[PDB]
Ligand binder design. Structure first.
Ligand SMILES: *[C@@H]1O[C@H](CO)[C@@H](O)[C@H](O)[C@H]1NC(C)=O
Lengths: 49, 226
């Protein structure tokens, strides 16, 4: 294909390029910390009006 | 630190309305509950209403429902209390008390006051406001000891009693015996004060008795002379 013919002579030719390909989609983010005050606004005791 | 200054209060006719305020200063007006509690003269205290750290009503008493409405303003850091249809049994010193705990989310309802203020005398009657009458009590020349001579003021003819006496600028916290007022069988009251007043040799106070009365706003700056 890269040397279009049907009687290619003797020699070495560069045709392709290998490439080992992935096997996961690892995503690494840090730890959760200092959660927002959503526990005292959705689980409060009393509202006003 | 905490300065719970209270504004709004005076003589109003029975059946009218007024707005009370309590400007907070010193802490964060987003995590401490502030309530309203009245105190009749020499007849104990009485809780009116209260609001938690957020905008939330915690209830009223058994005699103020439907007439009183409390509101909280976290933006201006001030708690307001509306009073409608005031009657004769609403004359007391309404205080502005805070709460000690931070009122976490999951706990038990338990409110107890930690910081108190001064209160505003909210008197409700049919009488009218009268103008005070300051008089320069003569510091007579009776001289036996060092500071035996004393001068003061003779404020009288005033129905409400939000009386605050000053001498120079709101200072001189030394011995000043401000005698309480008394109803002289006519609704009016009478104020007087006594200072040390040492030997007068052009080295004494400015001889000024500033009397501030909110329902009868008038700046009296009369001097006292022997
Ligand atoms: C409210 O409290 C319950 C029990 O503590 C908890 O399961 C829930 O996650 C809380 N809700 C919020 C919005 O945090």
């Amino acid at each position: 294909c890269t040397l279009k013919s049907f009687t290619v002579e003797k020699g070495i030719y560069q045709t392709s390029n290998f490439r080992v390909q992935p096997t996961e989609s690892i995503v690494r983010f840090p730890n959760i910390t200092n959660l927002c005050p959503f526990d005292e606004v959705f689980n409060a005791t009393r509202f006003a009006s | 630190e905490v300065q719970l200054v209270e504004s709004g209060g005076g003589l109003v006719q029975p059946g009218r309305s007024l707005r009370l305020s309590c400007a907070a200063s010193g802490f964060t007006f987003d995590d401490y509950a502030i309530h309203w509690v009245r105190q009749a003269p020499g007849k104990g205290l009485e809780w009116v209403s209260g609001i938690t750290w957020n905008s939330g009503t915690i209830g009223y008493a058994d005699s103020v429902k439907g007439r009183f409405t409390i509101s909280r303003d976290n933006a201006k850091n001030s708690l307001y209390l509306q009073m409608n249809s005031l009657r004769a049994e609403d004359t007391a010193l309404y205080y502005c008390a805070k709460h000690h705990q931070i009122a976490v989310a999951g706990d038990a309802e338990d409110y107890y006051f930690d910081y108190w203020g001064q209160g505003t005398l909210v008197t409700v009657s049919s009488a009218s406001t009268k103008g005070p009458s300051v008089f320069p009590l003569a510091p007579s020349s009776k001289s036996t000891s060092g500071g035996t001579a004393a001068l003061g003021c003779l404020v009288k003819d005033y129905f409400p009693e939000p009386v605050t006496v000053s001498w120079n600028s709101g200072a001189l916290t030394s011995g000043v015996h401000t005698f309480p007022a008394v109803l002289q069988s006519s609704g009016l009251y009478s104020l007087s004060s006594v200072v040390t007043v040492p030997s007068s040799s052009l080295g004494t106070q400015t001889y000024i008795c500033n009397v501030n009365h909110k329902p009868s706003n008038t700046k009296v700056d009369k001097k006292v002379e022997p």
